[model samples]
Target: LKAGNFDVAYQNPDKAIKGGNLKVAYQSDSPMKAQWLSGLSNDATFATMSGPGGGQDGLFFTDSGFKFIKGGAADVALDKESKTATITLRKDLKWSDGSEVTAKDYEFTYETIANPAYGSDRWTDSLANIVGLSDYHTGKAKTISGITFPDGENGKVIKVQFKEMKPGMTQSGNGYFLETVAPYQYLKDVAPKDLASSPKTTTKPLVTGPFKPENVVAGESIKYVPNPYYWGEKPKLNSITYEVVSTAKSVAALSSSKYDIINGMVSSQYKQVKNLKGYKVLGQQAMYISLMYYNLGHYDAKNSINVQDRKTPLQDQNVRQAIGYARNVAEVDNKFSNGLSTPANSLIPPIFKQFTSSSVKGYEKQDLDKANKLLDEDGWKLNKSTGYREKDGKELSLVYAARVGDANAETIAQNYIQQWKKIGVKVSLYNGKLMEFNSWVDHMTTPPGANDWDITDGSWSLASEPSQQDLFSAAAPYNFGHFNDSEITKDLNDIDSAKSENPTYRKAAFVKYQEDMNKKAYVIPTNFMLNYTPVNKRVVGMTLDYGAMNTWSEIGVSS
Candidate 1:
C-alpha cells in the first residue's frame, strides 16, 4: 500500500486466487475520447486503472479537498515565502514501451494544459494560480513562467510558483489538484490541435500504469491487458474489457454471464436482479449529489412559460427559497432509487465528514405552508381566473431542462414537476437527450442573462479536490446559473487560499460558505442517490468503491 508511482496500492488484507478475465461495462461511449488529451471525459466512461483515463487521482480530479491518498508518484512540498509547491517526479519511472519516465514529460503535460490551443475540462480553472497561467489562458502570455523542471542528474522536481494564494490554491487540506503526469517525449508531436482525432487514437498511448488498452472501437468499448512493464506489484487479472451496455439490457447481460461488471443499472432493475442465481449487486454512495440550479438571470427566449418577461422571478431569494421548499427530494429518491439514496441537505456530501454542514430547515422535507407564505409575502398572489399565482403580469411558471434517457434522472425530473404544480406554480418540462441537455444548460451561462429554463435537473461527479471556490467563482464557466455574490466569492477564495494548514480553519470557512448557500437557495440540492452495479457472484478481490483502481488490477475469481 505504499506509493508505487501512479498506481496507488490497496491490499485486500486476505489474498485471493488469481488468473481470470475481468469484463466490465458502462452506459455510454462518450468518454473514450478521454484517451485523447483533446476530448472531455465523462467519469462513467473512463475507469481504466492507469494512464490518463484511470481513477480521479491518477489523472484529472484533485484529491486535495481532503487529505490526499498516502502514496503515489511525485512528492509535494509547500513554501510559504515563494508561494510555490515543489513536486518532484521520480526519475526511475518507466512507460509501457520501456522508455524512462522523465521530468520533461511532466513539463509537456503543463505545456499542453497551459497552452490555450489544448485546454480541456480535464483541466482546472484553478490553474490560473500558476504564476502566468491566467495570462496564458487569456492569450496575454506565450508561455507560463511559473513552471520549472530542475532535471539535473537525479533531481526529481517540478517547481511551481503560485501567482497569489488565491482561494483555489493549496490550503489546509486541498486545491484544484494536478493529477495527470505524462510522457512528454511520447506525446510531443501529433499536432497538439489534432490529438482528439489524430491517428494516435487507435493504439493506446504509451502509459506507465497497470494496463494498456487493446482492440479499441470508436463508439463501442475497449479491451485492456496488463502492461508487462508495469513497475508495481504484478496485476492479478490477465485482461479487463469494458463495453457500452444499454440500461434496458442490463438484466439480460447479467443473465447471460457475459460481463463480470455492469456500470449503470437503474433502480428499476433492482426487483429484476433480486433473485439472480449467481450474482451480487453492489451499491455505491456519495462523492456526488443531484441538484436543480435556479437561474437568477433574465428571461430566456427558449422558456415558453416565462417568455413574456425576460426578467425572471428567480432573481428574488424569496422565490428561490420557496421553490426549494416546494421540492420533494425524499419522495423522488424513494420512488426511483429503491430508497437507496439519502436526502442531501448539504451541498457537500457526508463522504467528507469534516466539510459536511447541515442545511436550513425544509431542505430535507417539503414545507408547503412556508412555501405558500413566502410566495404570498413576495406578492405572488393566486390568479382566480387561471388558478395559478401571478405577480406584476408574470405568472408563476417555470421550465426545467433535464437529462432524459437515463430512467432515474428523467423520473426524478418528472417528480419535481408534480411538486412544482402545488402553490399555484405552472411547470413545463423539456425532456431531451443527455448531450444536448448539457449544451442547453451552457446556453444559459450569459450574465444578466435569462435562461429558458427557470431550473434544470442534473448532477456532476465532483473531484476530491474542492471546486466550490471556482465552480461559483465569477469567472468559472461552471457557475451554471451565472450567479455572483461578493461575499460568497470572497469566502470561496479564502477557503482555498487561507494560509492555515490546520483543518479547523478551512473547515470553518467551508461551513460559512455552506450555510450561506443553503440560505441563498440558488441551487436546490436533491439527494446523494445510490449508485448500483452488478457483478457475477464468482468475482472476488474487488472493493465496494466503484472504479477502485488497485482492486480491479488485482481482481480475481473464486471458483
Candidate 2:
C-alpha cells in the first residue's frame, strides 16, 4: 500500500470548479447501470472509484490509492484459528435515503447473494470466502450458518467465518475491503428471482457513496446526480451521465463534441484521438489483458449420438505452441494498438503487485519457421490437394471467433489468419456477439461441435486480488477450457491457502501460477491493454487510474 494519501490532495475540492454535464459511455446493460453490488468488480458501471474523495483530514476510501489519514471507520477483529473476522461497521454511517447504513446491509447482501433459491452464478462474491456458504448454496440451510448478527448494539458487527483464512480474504483489492453493502431495507422484499429485472437493477438503488444515480434508461443511459442525503462531504459536480456509445464510433464521437468524456476508446485510435484539438487522451497501463483462449472443453459435456467427438486441436500442446509461434504478437500490437500496449507475459494482468511476476515468456515476435516445424512435428502434414494441413483424414481447419464490431480485433484477427495459413492451417473466422437466452453469458458455453468457436479472442478484467482459484481451478465452472494441470491447480490452491498477513506469500504464489500457466500456454497472452481514454480539454483536475476510474467527481470547467 502507498504509505500515505495521494501526493497532493483535491485542494479546496468541495468548492472547486464544478457544474457541467459529463457524458460517459456504457457498452451493455442491466446490473452495469445500477451496479452498486452486482457489478462492483467491473467498470461495467460508471465511476465508483473515481478520484477527489480521499486525503489527509478527509474521508478515507478503502479502494482509494492513498493511505490512512485518520482513525479507521470500521473495526476488524481477525481470529487466526477460527479463520473468522468480525467487521464492526461504524454506526454513524448513513445511506443516501436517510436510513443509517448498518452491518445488516452487509449481512443481507451476503444472504441474498448466497441464497440457495436465488442460485446466483456470481457466487464468488461471498461464497468461497465465508464459512458454511457451501451448505447455504446447496439448499441445505434455511439461513446462512456462518453469518450471525449479534444482538442489541452488537448487531452492528458482521461476523464472517471463512472455511479457511484465505490469504485473499483480508486483502484490499479493486474496491476497498470486501465489505460491500446493499441497502437492506429497500431490497429485502424483492424476490431473488426478480432481482435481476428489478427496477433497481437498471435504475438507482440506495447509495452511501457521494453520488446517487437517477434518470436511468435501461440498457442505454444513466444520469447520476449527487445524493442530497450523502453524509460525507458532498460531490462538487452537479451530475455525470453515462450513455451507450458503440466502441467503433467512440473516438469519432469524442472528437465530434458529443460526449464530455469517452473513456472506452480502443488503442488503435491513439494518435488520432490524442491529436483532437479539444481533448486530452490520458493513457495508463490498463487493468485488462486481451488474449486468445485455447479452448479444450469450454463446451457442455454430453452426447446425443453417444459417440466420442472430435478433440479441439488446441488440446494438443504442440498445436497451441505452433499458433503462438505463428503469432507476431509484437507486430500485432504495433499494427493494431500502435504501441499503445505492452506485450503481455502473464494471463494475470500486471497490475496487482501481490499476485503475479515477470518471469514467463512466449512469442514476443514472429517465428514462422518454428510454427511450420511445430505443426509438422505434431503430425499435421501439408495436404497436396488444398494447401492445408491434415492429420489422418481430418483437415486442420479451425474456426476463430472474435468479438463483433471491434475494429482493432478485426485487424489483428485477419493478420493472425494470414500467418497461420502460411503454415498450412485453414482458419474460418466467426464474429461472435453470441449471448445466451436473455443472459449476458458468452457463446463459448455451448458444446464444441454445437458451436464453431475453437480459438476465441478473450479478455478478462480480473479482481485486484491475485487469488484466481475461481477462474483457474480444475473444478471451477469458470474454467472454460477445463484446463486440469496439476501444477496450476496446486499453485493456485497454495495462493488461496497462503497464511501470510500481507501479499508477500501471495505474490510468490502468483509468480508460480504465472510460470505454470505460461509453461502450458493454455491461454496465450498477447498484450495488456492501455487505457487511451480522451477527456475534453475544458475539464480540469481530472486524473484517472488504470481501471478508468476518472476523477470526474471533482473536476471543473476550464472556461
Candidate 3:
C-alpha cells in the first residue's frame, strides 16, 4: 500500500497499560556515534528514533500543516516591522534535573551553533541575519548583540533582533532560529570544541523531554526513564530501551519479537515483515528525498559560500540534464523499495502539497533518445571505437561516490552505472569501491576545488519548513555540489525575503524556482520515499505526522 493508504499512527485498539518498558529497534548499516545533539550528529537513525517525540522535544510546536502555533514549550511572536522576534518560555517548564528552563538555555543553543570552535554544520546564511550573529560567529563579539534577555538571562523572555525580517521566521527549521535548548548550567564548563565528545553530552546529557537518559552504552543502546521534573503530560511507560540493530539482521530481529517498535525500518524489507502477525505496519510520505549531485565547484568554509568552478563534463547543463533523463529512477525504486517510492519531480517532497510545483515536469521517466540528443547538442560526440561519448578528446567519464550500506546500496550504485553507460557516459566508482558512511560524507562535504568525486549520491531528512535556502543557497555550507548560479541565488534569497510573506507571491516564486532548478539539473532528485514502521499490537501513541506534539509522554503498552 502507498503512504496515505496506511495509518500514520499505531493501529492498536486496546486501551494503554502503564509501566511496561518499550524496546525500540534502530536499524543502521554502520555503528552509531555517541553524539546525540541535533547539530552534532548527522546519523539518520538517531534522528528517526528521537523525532516525533521519542527523545528530547523542541521548544516550539506547530500545527498539522507545520505552522508554528500555541501549546509549545515557548511562544514566539514575530514583529516584521520591528525586525525582531520575542520568545517567551512557559513558567512551569523545567529541566530533567529540576532546574527551571530559562531563556539562557535557548541562547546557549544558538551560541553553540554559531561558535566556530564547535564545528557545527547548523550555521547557515539565514541564521547570520540576526544582528550581531556574524560578528559573534567570527569572534569579533563575545556575545551576540542581536539577542537580549529582556527580563535578564534567568527570565523567561528572549528578544532577538534581526538585520532583516524573513517570511520563514515563524516556522521551525527555517534556519533563522532554533527550537531545541541547551543545559547552560550543566554544560557551561565544557569547552566548545570538546562539547560534542564530552561524556556530559554523549552519555549523561540532561533533557527537558518527557524522558531522560538513565543508561547509555555509547554507540550500542540507551535506556531512558521518565523525567521526574517533566513539565508536560507524564509518561506512562516505565522505561524505553533503544538499541541499534544491524540493518541486515533487522528482519530476523523483528521476526523474533525482540522489539516493540522498529524506528528506522527499511522500505526495501517490507516484504519480509509485512506478513508478521500481531503487528501493524504504519506508513507515511517521508520527509526525505534521494538525490544525485554533480560536483560543480568547492565550498569556502571561511567565507561560507560555494565557489563555482566547473571542472568536469557534468558541469554542462545539457550533460547534467542528459544524466537525469538516462536514470531509470522509477524502475530502480520499484524493484528495490517494493513500490513504496515515487519518481521525484522536485526537491520539495509531495507531503507539502502547496509548495511542491505541479507544472514542472522533471525527468519522470527514462528517455534514451532525449538523453542522447542532449549529449549530442552539448558537443559530446559518441566514438564508435570506444563506445563512449567524447568532447575535445576528453571522454565524458565521471567519478561517483556512494555510501556502503546494505547490499542494495551497492546494487543501486551499479544499476546507475549501467544506466549511464547506455547514454555513452562512462561512470566508475570512486577508488574502485564503495566507501563507508563517514568516509563518503567526508568526500561529499569536501571544500571547493578539492572534491575527488565528480558526482555523489546524497539524501536529506528535511526540516518541516519548505524553505530550501539552507541546503541549496550559494552561501550554504551544506551546498556540497558547489553549484552557484546568479539567478538561482536570487530565487533562493527571495523565498525567504519579506516579499515571500504573501502566500500567492510565495507559491509563484516556488513554481519559478522549481522550473529553473529542473532545467539546471545540478542536483537531480531521484526518489520521494514512503517510510514504513512496524509496531507491536500493544504499543501505543506513535505517530508519523509532521506536527505531533507530546507523542512520547502519551505512549504506553497494553496489559
- Our model 1 lands, by Cα RMSD against the true structure, at 6.3
Give one digit per residue, the lDDT tens place, for model 1 in 1-559: 1111111222234445667687788755254443533232334455432232234224221242345433455556667678887776554556667777665665566666666576445455567767876787677877667777677422467777886654333422344335555666666676767654554543456666667776677657767777776655677777777777776677788889978777666666777876787766666554787777876544332531122223678888888898889888777666665655777877776556556565434288888898889999999998988878999888888777776545666566666777777877887775333336556556655533545667776576775545585466655555567666777777777677554345677677777777778888777777765555666767776545433435545677665
Residue-level lDDT of model 2, residues 224-278, one tens digit each, is 7776765545566787776777767776677688886765555556667756887
RMSD of 3: 4.4
lDDT of 3 by residue, 1-559 (tens): 2365677887568889859899997888777675656776667666655542324447887866577887788889998888888988989888878998898988998888898898888788778889899999999999999999988999999999998778877666677877777888988999999998899778887777788878778778878888888777888998888888988888887788899788676676888888999688888888787788888888888998888886778778899999999988888877877757788888888777556664668887899899999999888999989989998988988888877874488888899899999999999998889889898776666665455788787888887787787689998877878999998988887777678887667767777888888889988887787888888888877777766787778788986
Kindly state the number of residue pairs that clash in model 1: 10
TM-scores, each model vs. reference: 0.78, 0.73, 0.81
lDDT at 496 for candidate 3?
71
- The deviation in Å at residue 239 for candidate 2 is 4.3
lDDT (0-100) at residue 338 of candidate 1?
Answer: 61
Superposition TM-score, candidate 2 onto the true structure: 0.73
Q: Estimate candidate 2's alpha-carbon lDDT, on a 0 to 1 scale.
A: 0.60
Q: Model 2: how large is the Cα RMSD against the reference?
A: 6.5
User: Which lDDT value does model 2 have at 50?
Assistant: 26
Please give the distance, in angstroms, between residue 445's alpha carbon in candidate 2 and its true position after superposition: 2.6
Candidate 1 — what's its lDDT? 0.62
Q: Candidate 3, 409: how far from true, in Å?
A: 4.6
lDDT sort, best first: 3, 1, 2
Alpha carbon lDDT of each predicted model = 0.62, 0.60, 0.81
